[PDB]
Amino acid sequence: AGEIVCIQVGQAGNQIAGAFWQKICAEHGIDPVNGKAIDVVGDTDIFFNTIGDKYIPRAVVVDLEPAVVENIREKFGTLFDPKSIVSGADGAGNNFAIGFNEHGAETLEKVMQVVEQRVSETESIGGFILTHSCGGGTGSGFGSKILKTIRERYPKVPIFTFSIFPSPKISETVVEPYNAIMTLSNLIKYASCSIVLDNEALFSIAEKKLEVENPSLEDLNLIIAQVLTNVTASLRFSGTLNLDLGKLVTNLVPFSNLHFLMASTAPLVLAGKESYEKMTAKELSAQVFGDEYICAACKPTTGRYLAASVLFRGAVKTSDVNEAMATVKEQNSFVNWIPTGFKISKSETSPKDSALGVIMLGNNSEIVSVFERIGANFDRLWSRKAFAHWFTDSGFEEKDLDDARALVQKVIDDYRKLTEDAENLYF
Amino acid sequence: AGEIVCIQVGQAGNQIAGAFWQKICAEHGIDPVNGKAIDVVGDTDIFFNTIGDKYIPRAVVVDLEPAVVENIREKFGTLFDPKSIVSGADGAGNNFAIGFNEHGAETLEKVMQVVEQRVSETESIGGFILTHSCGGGTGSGFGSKILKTIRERYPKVPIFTFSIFPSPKISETVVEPYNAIMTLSNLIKYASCSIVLDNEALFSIAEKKLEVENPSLEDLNLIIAQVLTNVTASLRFSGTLNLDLGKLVTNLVPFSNLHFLMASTAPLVLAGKESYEKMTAKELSAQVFGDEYICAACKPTTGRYLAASVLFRGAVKTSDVNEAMATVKEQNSFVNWIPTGFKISKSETSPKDSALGVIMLGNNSEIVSVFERIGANFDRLWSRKAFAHWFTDSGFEEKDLDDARALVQKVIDDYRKLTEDAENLYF
Amino acid sequence: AREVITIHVGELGIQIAPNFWKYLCDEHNIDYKGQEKGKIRGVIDNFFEKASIGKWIPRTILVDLGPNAIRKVTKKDMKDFFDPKRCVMGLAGDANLFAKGYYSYGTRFMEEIMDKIQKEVDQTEHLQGFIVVHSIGDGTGAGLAPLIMEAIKKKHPKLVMMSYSIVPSQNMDCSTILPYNAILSLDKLTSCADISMIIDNDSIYRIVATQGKENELSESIFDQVLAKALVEITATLRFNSPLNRSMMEMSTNLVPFPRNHFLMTSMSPLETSLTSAHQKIETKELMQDLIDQDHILAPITVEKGVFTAFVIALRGENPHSILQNSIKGFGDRVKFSEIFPTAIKADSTTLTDEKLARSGITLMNHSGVANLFQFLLTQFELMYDHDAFTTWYYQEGMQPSEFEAAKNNIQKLITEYKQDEY
Ligand SMILES: Nc1nc2c(ncn2[C@@H]2O[C@H](COP(=O)(O)OP(=O)(O)O)[C@@H](O)[C@H]2O)c(=O)[nH]1
Ligand SMILES: Nc1nc2c(ncn2[C@@H]2O[C@H](COP(=O)(O)OP(=O)(O)O)[C@@H](O)[C@H]2O)c(=O)[nH]1
C-alpha cells in the first residue's frame, strides 16, 4: 500500500539517488547492476516493480541534459528502466530561471506522463521522494517546478525532499544564492518535509568518521545514501508497528511552514567488515545527537528542539532505549508546548554492515543559521545586482526575487520567535 | 525381490551415476575399481549381480558418443561390465531432436536388449532409476525416448528420474530451454517420480557446507551422489520395516501429474574424518528442512507441502524424531486435505562418514518457480524463432514444441491452483 | 455457553493477538493449528468456534487501516490460526491521527466491519458480550475502536461491552501527538464501553525491569505481560469460577455509576518465566503482592486514593481463612468512602499452568485513575492552546469545537473520580 515513487532531478540528484538505489539492492538481495534476483527479503514492493525475476526501482529520472540515458547505462547498468528516463535538449547553466521558466513545455509534460505511469502501477501512493541540489540549474528550477506540479496534481500526498544546500564557508558559483533562495521558497510552499544537507558537514564526517583518506563526492554520497536507506528501513522491513512517510510528517511538523529537518546517522560503515562491534544503543544515541554526525552546517546541541524522531535498527534492547533516551532528554533543550518531545520507533532488521544502527531526524531551531547565511549572501549581491541580468532576462521580475526572499525570511522569523518565546513558556 | 536396474544416459548421467556407484561400493564393502570383494555387508543383491567374488552393478550405460567404453575404463576401471555399455556413432549436438528422433533404430534396439537382459536376471523388478541432464542432446532426447520405451514395455513399474535442470541465473547454451521443455514434457508423461536438481543450488552448497575451496563438477557430484546413496539406504540395508521405490511413489504422489520432488541431505562429508560429531537428530532435521541444503534453485520454506518424507539413518532416538518432527510441523506449511503430512522411516545403519544422517524428499509447491523460469525463457526464444530451425529441420513440428510447452504449463497451473485454494481449506 | 467475541483494533491490538491466543490455546489444550491436543478443558466454546471438522477457530476479528499488522500476524507469527475472512484491511493507515480512525478514513470500512461482526454473531446462540482490544495511542486504535463500539452498541444494546485500553509509554512508544489522540479517544470511550480496563505501558516497562534486575530477560517479555493480563482478566469467563462468572457480573461488581467505569489492574507473578526455580508463593504472600507497587500496571499507589470497588481473583488452592485474614490485614492501605462497606471480594478458580503453585489478578475501581487522565490532559492543553499539530486534524474534518468538547468532558471525568478524595 505505502508505495514510494522517487523523483531524481539533475546531476547531483541522480548521483545521490543512484547510491541509494544500489544500497537498497544490497539489503533486499537484488543485483545492483541488473535488477535480477532469485531470493529476496523484506517488502520489496514498496520501492520496486517486480516483473518476472527483475526488480525495477520506481523512479523518475529527470534532466535537461542531452544524453542522460547513456550517462546512466555507463554507471548503473540496467538497473533503471529507460522508459522512465527523461532526457533534455540543451540544459540549464546554473540558472534557476532556465530550469524553472525556459525548460520547454514538452520536457515537463513527459516528466508528468512518467510520474502518472509510476503512480498508476500502485494500489496506493505512500508518498514521493525528491532528490536534488539547490545551487544547480535543473535540480533547483526544474525540480522546483516539478514539486509545484506534483503537489497540484496530488495534494494530500507527503512529499519529502532531500537536498543539498550551499556549504557554510566556501561557495561554488556567484549565482548560487539566487538559485538557493528561489529553490528554498518553493520548498517552503510545496514540500511536506525537507531534509537539509550540505557538503561541508558531510566532508568533515567523511574525513573523521569514515576510514577513507582524501574522500571524493563518490564517498560523500555514501553518507547521504546511508541517511536515505536508514530512514526507509521500517517501510522496507515492515513490522507490526512501523513508520511511513505520513507518520513522519504528522509527528515532526507542528506548523505547515516549519518542516525543515536535520538528519544524523551512526555508525557509518563502508562495505566490508571494517566496523567494530560496539553493540551499544546508548553509545549510538549519544553519537547521533552529538554535533559530529550532523549532515548540515549547524550545531544542534546549542539550539532547541520542537520535535525529533529516532529510529533504531537491529537487536536493540528496550531497556537501553529507555535509558538512552532519558539521557538525551536531560542533556538537550526542548520547547515546552510540545510536551512529549519525541517519536520513537524500532525495526529489528540490521543494516547490512552493522548489527545495530540509529537514524535521527528533527526540528532544531538552529537550522535558521543555514538559511540566514544564504539570505545575507543574496542580499549583498541583490543590492548590487551582480549576475542579476541572468535571472530577469530569463523571465523573472525583481518582484519574484524579492518575494522569494521575503518568504524565506518569514520562515526564519517564525523559527526564531518561537525559540526565544520558549524560554518563558516554562514559567 | 526389489531389484533395481539403473539407466545412465549421456555424459552427465554417467558421471553422476559413476559417483553413486563408487559410494555404494564403499558402504557395502566392494572394491570400487574392480568389483571384487570377499566380505560384504547389507543386501547387495538389490544393486549388484554377484558372480563368483565379483559384484557387478546392474546398470545400462547409454550414449551416442563413439567411444563410450574406453571413456569408462579410464575412470571406473573394471567396475562396469562392458556388455552393458551401449556406444553410439556420431552424437547429439545439444539437440533434443537428434537424441529423440534421429538416433538410429539400432542404437535404441541395443539399449532395449541390454535392459531386457538386466531385468531377466531378477526374481522381481523393484523399479528403474534414470540418471540424466535436461539441457544435453542425449540425456534429454534419448533419455526421454528411453523413458517412453521402458514405460511401454514395463507399465506399473516405478521409474525414478534424477535430473539436472537449468540453473536459475546463468544458462549454458541458447538452445537449453528447448531441450529442457521437451525433456520435462516427457518426464511429466512417463516418470513415476522426478527429482529436480540443479547446479546453482549445488554450487552454493559445495562452497558453504563442504570444506572444499573452489569446487569443480567432480566435487559437486558428491552432493548428488550423497542424495542418491541415502535415498536407497533402507532398500540396501533392509530392516523389518523399510522403504522401496513403490512406497515412495504411493506416499509422495497424490495425483498422477504432480510427481516432481525436491531433495535435501545433511551432513555432507567428504571422505576422511573431517566431520564433527553433532550427533543430534534435531539439528539434522532443522537443517534438512531449511533452505540451505536444498539441491534446487527454489526456497521451500516459503511454499506449501503436499507431502514429504524423511529417512533417518544411524542410531537416531525415537524420542528425538518425534520432537524434531513436531517442530517441523509447527514451522512449515502444509495443505489441509493431506492431513498426516509425512512419511517417516528409519534405518539403523550409519552412512560411512557420519554416525547419523538425514535425507528428505518432498512435494513443495515452490517447485513451479523452476518450471516457470524455463517456460518464460522458451517463450521469448520461441516467439522470435531463434535456434528453432535446429528442431524443426530435425523432425519436430511447431505443434510439438507448442504441445510440450502446454503440458508443462498444465502442471504449473495445477500446482499453483491447488496451493492458492489451500489457504481456505482450513475454514 | 455464554460466548464472547474478541475484536483486535489497530497495530498494537493486533501485535498482542498472537500472545493472547497462544495462551488460550495452551490453557485449554489446543494446538496452534486449532487441533485438539489431548483432553480439552474449560468452557472452550466461550472463545473458540467449532469447525465442521475437528479444528477450533478463535472467535475473533482483526482490524487494521493499513495491511501490515495483520499480514505479519496471520502469515508469520501464528499461521493458519486466524480466519482470513475475519480480517479487515485498509491501505492508507492512519498517519497517527484520531481523525482518520474516527472521521475521514475509517468510516468507509464500517459496512465491512459490521458485516463481519454479524457473521460472527450469527454463529452463536448465547452471546454474552464483546471485548475490544485496542491502543489509545495511534489513530487506528484511538479512532476506530470507539467507532466500532458505537456501531455495536446501537445494534446489540443488551450486550456487555468491555474494552482493553492500552496507554502507550512516554518513552519507547512515544509520539509527539499522543496527548491529542488520548484525550479525543477517552472522550468516546466514556460513552461507548460498559467496562474499560486501563493498562499503562510505562508501568509494565518499570515493573519488568525491576523483576529483571538480576537477569537478561527477553525482549518478548513486555508483550507477554500485556497479553497475559487480558488472559487472566478473562479466566473467570472461561472456567467454572465462583467469581466474575459473566461480563454482566463484572459490570455489577465494579461499576456503580455509568461514567465511573475505568478500571485498574494488578497482577502476580506477572509472568511464569519471571518467577522460576523455587516459587512456592504461599496464599499469604500472593495477596500482599497484589496490592504492592510493583504489581500494579498503572502509576498508582493504592494507599494514595480511594477505592469504590475491589475484586481479587485468584487461581489454585487458596484457603478462605487465609484470604480473609489477608484482607483484614490490608488495614488502611485499602480504603473506601464512608458511604461504602469495605466491599473487598476474593475467591479462587482453576489453575492450568503446571509451573505455578498459584496466581492472581485484581480489578480495581480506584480514584487514582484520575491522575493518569490529568497527566494526559495537561499535556493536551499545552499543545492545544498553542495550536501544535492541529492543522493535521483540521484538514480531515475535526472542526475545532471537537477538541474543546473532549477537553471539557475529560476535566469533568477527573473531577468526578476525585470527589471522594476531598
Ligand atoms: N553531496 C553531493 N554533492 C554534489 C554532487 N554533485 C554535485 N554536488 C553539488 O551540487 C551543486 C549543484 O550541482 P550541478 O552540477 O550544477 O547540478 P545541476 O545543474 O542541477 O544538474 C554543486 O555545486 C555541488 O556543490 C554529488 O555527487 N554529491
Ligand atoms: N552436476 C553435474 N552437472 C553436469 C555434469 N556434467 C555436465 N553437467 C550439466 O549438464 C548439462 C548438459 O550436459 P551435456 O554434456 O550436453 O550432456 P549430453 O549432451 O546429454 O551428453 C551441462 O550444460 C551442465 O550444466 C556433472 O558432472 N555433474
mmCIF file with all atom_site columns, N, CA and C in Angstrom, chain B residues 301-335:
data_model
loop_
_atom_site.group_PDB
_atom_site.id
_atom_site.type_symbol
_atom_site.label_atom_id
_atom_site.label_alt_id
_atom_site.label_comp_id
_atom_site.label_asym_id
_atom_site.label_entity_id
_atom_site.label_seq_id
_atom_site.pdbx_PDB_ins_code
_atom_site.Cartn_x
_atom_site.Cartn_y
_atom_site.Cartn_z
_atom_site.occupancy
_atom_site.B_iso_or_equiv
_atom_site.pdbx_formal_charge
_atom_site.auth_seq_id
_atom_site.auth_comp_id
_atom_site.auth_asym_id
_atom_site.auth_atom_id
_atom_site.pdbx_PDB_model_num
ATOM 1   N N  . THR B 1 301 ? 10.948 -23.089 2.261  1.00 0.00 ? 301 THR B N  1
ATOM 2   C CA . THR B 1 301 ? 10.311 -22.648 3.499  1.00 0.00 ? 301 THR B CA 1
ATOM 3   C C  . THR B 1 301 ? 9.210  -21.618 3.252  1.00 0.00 ? 301 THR B C  1
ATOM 4   N N  . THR B 1 302 ? 9.100  -21.095 2.026  1.00 0.00 ? 302 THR B N  1
ATOM 5   C CA . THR B 1 302 ? 8.077  -20.114 1.712  1.00 0.00 ? 302 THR B CA 1
ATOM 6   C C  . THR B 1 302 ? 6.919  -20.707 0.932  1.00 0.00 ? 302 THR B C  1
ATOM 7   N N  . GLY B 1 303 ? 6.942  -22.011 0.676  1.00 0.00 ? 303 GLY B N  1
ATOM 8   C CA . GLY B 1 303 ? 5.887  -22.639 -0.105 1.00 0.00 ? 303 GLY B CA 1
ATOM 9   C C  . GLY B 1 303 ? 4.957  -23.441 0.787  1.00 0.00 ? 303 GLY B C  1
ATOM 10  N N  . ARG B 1 304 ? 4.280  -24.419 0.202  1.00 0.00 ? 304 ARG B N  1
ATOM 11  C CA . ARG B 1 304 ? 3.366  -25.254 0.958  1.00 0.00 ? 304 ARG B CA 1
ATOM 12  C C  . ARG B 1 304 ? 3.597  -26.710 0.551  1.00 0.00 ? 304 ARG B C  1
ATOM 13  N N  . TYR B 1 305 ? 3.616  -27.624 1.513  1.00 0.00 ? 305 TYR B N  1
ATOM 14  C CA . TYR B 1 305 ? 3.861  -29.028 1.205  1.00 0.00 ? 305 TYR B CA 1
ATOM 15  C C  . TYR B 1 305 ? 2.629  -29.871 0.973  1.00 0.00 ? 305 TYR B C  1
ATOM 16  N N  . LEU B 1 306 ? 2.704  -30.752 -0.019 1.00 0.00 ? 306 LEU B N  1
ATOM 17  C CA . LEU B 1 306 ? 1.565  -31.619 -0.222 1.00 0.00 ? 306 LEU B CA 1
ATOM 18  C C  . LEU B 1 306 ? 1.839  -32.861 0.573  1.00 0.00 ? 306 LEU B C  1
ATOM 19  N N  . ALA B 1 307 ? 3.097  -33.235 0.574  1.00 0.00 ? 307 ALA B N  1
ATOM 20  C CA . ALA B 1 307 ? 3.582  -34.414 1.242  1.00 0.00 ? 307 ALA B CA 1
ATOM 21  C C  . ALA B 1 307 ? 5.079  -34.322 1.348  1.00 0.00 ? 307 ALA B C  1
ATOM 22  N N  . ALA B 1 308 ? 5.643  -35.011 2.310  1.00 0.00 ? 308 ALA B N  1
ATOM 23  C CA . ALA B 1 308 ? 7.092  -35.086 2.414  1.00 0.00 ? 308 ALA B CA 1
ATOM 24  C C  . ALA B 1 308 ? 7.506  -36.359 3.103  1.00 0.00 ? 308 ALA B C  1
ATOM 25  N N  . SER B 1 309 ? 8.739  -36.782 2.897  1.00 0.00 ? 309 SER B N  1
ATOM 26  C CA . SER B 1 309 ? 9.216  -37.955 3.594  1.00 0.00 ? 309 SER B CA 1
ATOM 27  C C  . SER B 1 309 ? 10.572 -37.712 4.176  1.00 0.00 ? 309 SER B C  1
ATOM 28  N N  . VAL B 1 310 ? 10.806 -38.319 5.323  1.00 0.00 ? 310 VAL B N  1
ATOM 29  C CA . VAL B 1 310 ? 12.099 -38.192 5.954  1.00 0.00 ? 310 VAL B CA 1
ATOM 30  C C  . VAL B 1 310 ? 12.662 -39.536 6.346  1.00 0.00 ? 310 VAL B C  1
ATOM 31  N N  . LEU B 1 311 ? 13.864 -39.811 5.884  1.00 0.00 ? 311 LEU B N  1
ATOM 32  C CA . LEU B 1 311 ? 14.559 -41.028 6.246  1.00 0.00 ? 311 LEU B CA 1
ATOM 33  C C  . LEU B 1 311 ? 15.739 -40.715 7.127  1.00 0.00 ? 311 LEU B C  1
ATOM 34  N N  . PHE B 1 312 ? 15.729 -41.308 8.296  1.00 0.00 ? 312 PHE B N  1
ATOM 35  C CA . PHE B 1 312 ? 16.793 -41.113 9.250  1.00 0.00 ? 312 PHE B CA 1
ATOM 36  C C  . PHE B 1 312 ? 17.712 -42.294 9.196  1.00 0.00 ? 312 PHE B C  1
ATOM 37  N N  . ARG B 1 313 ? 19.008 -42.044 9.221  1.00 0.00 ? 313 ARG B N  1
ATOM 38  C CA . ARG B 1 313 ? 19.977 -43.114 9.247  1.00 0.00 ? 313 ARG B CA 1
ATOM 39  C C  . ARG B 1 313 ? 20.814 -43.075 10.501 1.00 0.00 ? 313 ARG B C  1
ATOM 40  N N  . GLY B 1 314 ? 21.157 -44.255 10.977 1.00 0.00 ? 314 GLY B N  1
ATOM 41  C CA . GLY B 1 314 ? 22.041 -44.408 12.115 1.00 0.00 ? 314 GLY B CA 1
ATOM 42  C C  . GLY B 1 314 ? 21.278 -44.478 13.417 1.00 0.00 ? 314 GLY B C  1
ATOM 43  N N  . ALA B 1 315 ? 21.987 -44.339 14.525 1.00 0.00 ? 315 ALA B N  1
ATOM 44  C CA . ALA B 1 315 ? 21.397 -44.524 15.843 1.00 0.00 ? 315 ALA B CA 1
ATOM 45  C C  . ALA B 1 315 ? 20.623 -43.315 16.333 1.00 0.00 ? 315 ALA B C  1
ATOM 46  N N  . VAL B 1 316 ? 19.514 -43.071 15.675 1.00 0.00 ? 316 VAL B N  1
ATOM 47  C CA . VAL B 1 316 ? 18.615 -41.979 15.973 1.00 0.00 ? 316 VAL B CA 1
ATOM 48  C C  . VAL B 1 316 ? 17.579 -42.403 16.996 1.00 0.00 ? 316 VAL B C  1
ATOM 49  N N  . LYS B 1 317 ? 17.411 -41.614 18.049 1.00 0.00 ? 317 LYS B N  1
ATOM 50  C CA . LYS B 1 317 ? 16.437 -41.948 19.081 1.00 0.00 ? 317 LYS B CA 1
ATOM 51  C C  . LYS B 1 317 ? 15.023 -41.649 18.636 1.00 0.00 ? 317 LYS B C  1
ATOM 52  N N  . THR B 1 318 ? 14.091 -42.544 18.949 1.00 0.00 ? 318 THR B N  1
ATOM 53  C CA . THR B 1 318 ? 12.685 -42.356 18.614 1.00 0.00 ? 318 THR B CA 1
ATOM 54  C C  . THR B 1 318 ? 12.150 -41.075 19.201 1.00 0.00 ? 318 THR B C  1
ATOM 55  N N  . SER B 1 319 ? 12.541 -40.789 20.428 1.00 0.00 ? 319 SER B N  1
ATOM 56  C CA . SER B 1 319 ? 12.074 -39.613 21.117 1.00 0.00 ? 319 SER B CA 1
ATOM 57  C C  . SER B 1 319 ? 12.491 -38.336 20.414 1.00 0.00 ? 319 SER B C  1
ATOM 58  N N  . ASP B 1 320 ? 13.688 -38.319 19.808 1.00 0.00 ? 320 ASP B N  1
ATOM 59  C CA . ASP B 1 320 ? 14.172 -37.120 19.159 1.00 0.00 ? 320 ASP B CA 1
ATOM 60  C C  . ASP B 1 320 ? 13.495 -36.969 17.836 1.00 0.00 ? 320 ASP B C  1
ATOM 61  N N  . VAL B 1 321 ? 13.149 -38.080 17.202 1.00 0.00 ? 321 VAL B N  1
ATOM 62  C CA . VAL B 1 321 ? 12.458 -37.963 15.940 1.00 0.00 ? 321 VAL B CA 1
ATOM 63  C C  . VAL B 1 321 ? 11.113 -37.345 16.190 1.00 0.00 ? 321 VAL B C  1
ATOM 64  N N  . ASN B 1 322 ? 10.420 -37.791 17.228 1.00 0.00 ? 322 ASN B N  1
ATOM 65  C CA . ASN B 1 322 ? 9.108  -37.248 17.453 1.00 0.00 ? 322 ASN B CA 1
ATOM 66  C C  . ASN B 1 322 ? 9.160  -35.779 17.806 1.00 0.00 ? 322 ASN B C  1
ATOM 67  N N  . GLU B 1 323 ? 10.123 -35.369 18.622 1.00 0.00 ? 323 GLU B N  1
ATOM 68  C CA . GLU B 1 323 ? 10.165 -33.963 18.959 1.00 0.00 ? 323 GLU B CA 1
ATOM 69  C C  . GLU B 1 323 ? 10.611 -33.132 17.764 1.00 0.00 ? 323 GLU B C  1
ATOM 70  N N  . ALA B 1 324 ? 11.598 -33.625 17.023 1.00 0.00 ? 324 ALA B N  1
ATOM 71  C CA . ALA B 1 324 ? 12.103 -32.891 15.892 1.00 0.00 ? 324 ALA B CA 1
ATOM 72  C C  . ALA B 1 324 ? 11.041 -32.711 14.843 1.00 0.00 ? 324 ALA B C  1
ATOM 73  N N  . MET B 1 325 ? 10.234 -33.738 14.616 1.00 0.00 ? 325 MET B N  1
ATOM 74  C CA . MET B 1 325 ? 9.221  -33.601 13.606 1.00 0.00 ? 325 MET B CA 1
ATOM 75  C C  . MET B 1 325 ? 8.088  -32.725 14.076 1.00 0.00 ? 325 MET B C  1
ATOM 76  N N  . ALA B 1 326 ? 7.844  -32.666 15.386 1.00 0.00 ? 326 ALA B N  1
ATOM 77  C CA . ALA B 1 326 ? 6.813  -31.775 15.873 1.00 0.00 ? 326 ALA B CA 1
ATOM 78  C C  . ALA B 1 326 ? 7.193  -30.340 15.541 1.00 0.00 ? 326 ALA B C  1
ATOM 79  N N  . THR B 1 327 ? 8.486  -30.022 15.667 1.00 0.00 ? 327 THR B N  1
ATOM 80  C CA . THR B 1 327 ? 8.980  -28.687 15.345 1.00 0.00 ? 327 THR B CA 1
ATOM 81  C C  . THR B 1 327 ? 8.772  -28.383 13.880 1.00 0.00 ? 327 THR B C  1
ATOM 82  N N  . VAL B 1 328 ? 9.061  -29.360 13.031 1.00 0.00 ? 328 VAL B N  1
ATOM 83  C CA . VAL B 1 328 ? 8.901  -29.183 11.601 1.00 0.00 ? 328 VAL B CA 1
ATOM 84  C C  . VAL B 1 328 ? 7.448  -28.928 11.249 1.00 0.00 ? 328 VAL B C  1
ATOM 85  N N  . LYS B 1 329 ? 6.526  -29.683 11.843 1.00 0.00 ? 329 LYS B N  1
ATOM 86  C CA . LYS B 1 329 ? 5.127  -29.455 11.537 1.00 0.00 ? 329 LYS B CA 1
ATOM 87  C C  . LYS B 1 329 ? 4.690  -28.062 11.964 1.00 0.00 ? 329 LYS B C  1
ATOM 88  N N  . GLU B 1 330 ? 5.161  -27.581 13.118 1.00 0.00 ? 330 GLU B N  1
ATOM 89  C CA . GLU B 1 330 ? 4.783  -26.247 13.564 1.00 0.00 ? 330 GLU B CA 1
ATOM 90  C C  . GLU B 1 330 ? 5.333  -25.118 12.706 1.00 0.00 ? 330 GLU B C  1
ATOM 91  N N  . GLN B 1 331 ? 6.569  -25.252 12.239 1.00 0.00 ? 331 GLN B N  1
ATOM 92  C CA . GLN B 1 331 ? 7.190  -24.199 11.453 1.00 0.00 ? 331 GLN B CA 1
ATOM 93  C C  . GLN B 1 331 ? 6.780  -24.129 9.991  1.00 0.00 ? 331 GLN B C  1
ATOM 94  N N  . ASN B 1 332 ? 6.535  -25.266 9.355  1.00 0.00 ? 332 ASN B N  1
ATOM 95  C CA . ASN B 1 332 ? 6.220  -25.250 7.938  1.00 0.00 ? 332 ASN B CA 1
ATOM 96  C C  . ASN B 1 332 ? 4.743  -25.167 7.626  1.00 0.00 ? 332 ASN B C  1
ATOM 97  N N  . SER B 1 333 ? 4.437  -25.121 6.343  1.00 0.00 ? 333 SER B N  1
ATOM 98  C CA . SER B 1 333 ? 3.067  -25.004 5.893  1.00 0.00 ? 333 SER B CA 1
ATOM 99  C C  . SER B 1 333 ? 2.683  -26.154 5.000  1.00 0.00 ? 333 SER B C  1
ATOM 100 N N  . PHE B 1 334 ? 1.553  -26.759 5.325  1.00 0.00 ? 334 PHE B N  1
ATOM 101 C CA . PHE B 1 334 ? 1.008  -27.937 4.654  1.00 0.00 ? 334 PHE B CA 1
ATOM 102 C C  . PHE B 1 334 ? -0.390 -27.683 4.116  1.00 0.00 ? 334 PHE B C  1
ATOM 103 N N  . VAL B 1 335 ? -0.794 -28.468 3.129  1.00 0.00 ? 335 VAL B N  1
ATOM 104 C CA . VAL B 1 335 ? -2.147 -28.362 2.596  1.00 0.00 ? 335 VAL B CA 1
ATOM 105 C C  . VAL B 1 335 ? -3.062 -29.265 3.459  1.00 0.00 ? 335 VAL B C  1
#
